[PDB]
């Protein structure tokens, strides 16, 4: 009987762990998108620095930068695996990876 | 009760700020991606323990 | 990723299910080859003694 | 203990053949469809989660 | 732009449809290779016992 | 982990082919016209500055 | 040691097929995209350094 | 030079990855051709003895 319980727990534990990997991948996609948006912002800042760019240029570059930052606020504010907002708030997700408590 | 507050004045350093954000983000991604290796090794452990 | 997680939950890898079907088939053939013997166990004694 | 009006040896052996038949039925059921959960395969977690 | 939007709605990219056709073909071959077994499951028991 | 009702290996490989298709589309788009910025090529600096 | 209720020979052989499936999956993943590191390919040095 | 170093870190030369995919494919075909044998190993003994 003890072995059957362990086997059931291990398999099920194994079945839940795959889910943890899936959640990590989902977070990574969002994170990758955020990083892509950030790379553009840095390049725009470098372009913006020159004495030469006019203030009518800096208005458009700021419009792009605020749209990119609204987008990395949105894609982290509302993204979810099974109704769980991964990036909106900070907390610990505990994985039961074993039959043991 | 939280909205980005209009900037008081032009940012003194537009880089330093974005290098810090990339470090927080890059660091977070790196931390996240080690947990996938931990879960993969735990799965290959549980397979042989079940067998 | 949602199709991956949903797939694990619903789709079942065969490699274990063909083996489970094979084990149930061998158990069925062994159980039927045993059942006949169980059936004829009593008759030999009764008729032999009678 | 050699009775023939009811053979107590054959009843249990049959029940085991019936259990093997049900296991073969579920394995064929999941092998043909391609999916582990249909209704009672997993009650709540699988179907609701799926 | 109207042909682009109309095209998405009507035209279907193959790359998923060849895979769906392949999955249905493997399910058909597995279902037929299972069906024969299901057919012969009963005969072994009846004839063997009889 | 040998499932056929949903092939988890083929979905990702396709997405990569779709990404390569979009990259080829932009390269052909800029090679035929002769111009890098059309609309979303560069959002603000290129088009506004241009 | 000739058991059929659980075939201890088939479970390990399958696990090896699953490991080969994962290796083929990563090789197809990197061959189609063109890039070795995606997420967990290299944890810290590759991605952070990249 | 930065694209060269970044490229080594992210881009992976195929010449090893096609070979790794081929080795995993041969291991998959050998593992499946072995799995069936493992499946039928027990049945011959049980049925033969029974």
Residue numbers in the entry:
A (entry chain A): 51 to 151
B (entry chain A): 405 to 455
C (entry chain F), E (entry chain K), H (entry chain L): 456 to 505
D (entry chain F), F (entry chain Q), G (entry chain L): 1 to 50
Please, what does the article write about this entry?
Salmonella has two flagellin genes, fljB and fliC, and their expression is autonomously regulated to produce either FljB or FliC for filament formation at a frequency of 10−3–10−4 per cell per generation. This is called phase variation, and it is thought to be a mechanism to enable escape from the host immune system by changing flagellar antigenicity. The molecule consists of four domains, D0, D1, D2, and D3, arranged from the inner core to the outer surface of the filament. Domains D0 and D1 form the inner core of the filament and are made of α-helical coiled coils.
We analyzed the structure of the FljB filament by cryoEM single-particle image analysis in one of the two mutant straight forms called the R-type. We used the R-type straight form to utilize the helical symmetry for image analysis as well as to compare the structure with the R-type straight filament formed by FliC. The 3D image of the FljB filament was reconstructed at 3.6 Å resolution from about 1.1 million segment images obtained from 2319 cryoEM movie images. It showed a tubular structure formed by a helical assembly of subunit proteins with an outer diameter of 230 Å and an inner diameter of 20 Å and with a similar helical parameter to the R-type straight filament formed by FliC. The 11 protofilaments could also be recognized as in the FliC filament structure. The missing residues 193–287, corresponding to domain D3, were not built because the resolution of the 3D map was too low to trace the chain. In addition, the density level of domain D3 was much lower than other domains in FljB, indicating that domain D3 was more mobile than other domains of FljB. This indicates that the two-chain hinge connection between domains D2 and D3 was relatively flexible, making domain D3 mobile. When domains D0, D1, and D2 were superimposed between FljB and FliC, domain D3 of FljB was tilted from that of FliC by about 30°, making its position nearly 20 Å higher than that of FliC. Unlike FliC, FljB did not have these contacts, with the corresponding Cα distance between Ala 191 and Thr 350 being 18.4 Å, possibly making the two-chain domain connection less stable and domain D3 oriented differently than FliC.
